[PDB]
């Protein structure tokens, strides 16, 4: 990060005088594709054996 130092004193304070309304984007997945797998069609083809 940026190497910066904060001026610290026992009788020094910083009171903000202005503000900026910011919007932060967060991406969260909640679901995935629902797949169904059966052995008889996957493991076997068209053979009874």
């Amino acid at each position: 990060g940026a190497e910066n130092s904060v001026a610290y004193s026992n009788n020094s304070i910083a009171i903000p005088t202005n503000f900026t309304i910011s919007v932060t984007t967060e991406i969260l997945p909640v679901s995935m594709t629902k797949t169904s797998v059966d052995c008889t069609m996957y493991i076997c083809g068209d053979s009874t054996e």
């Binding site: 990060g1 940026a2 190497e3 910066n4 130092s5 904060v6 001026a7 610290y8 004193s9 026992n10």
Partner: protein, 49 residues
Amino acid sequence: CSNLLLQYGSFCTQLNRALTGIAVEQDKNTQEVFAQVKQIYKTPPIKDF
């Protein structure tokens, strides 16, 4: 031994991809905990708190 491994190369692909995902998740875990701030704040030389 390698010639018979082409019959199971897909399995090796899944294993290698799973280990790579585990490693990159382990790398990403440290960034989500310690890298909360993007500015390195220096400790002031005055220790009178």
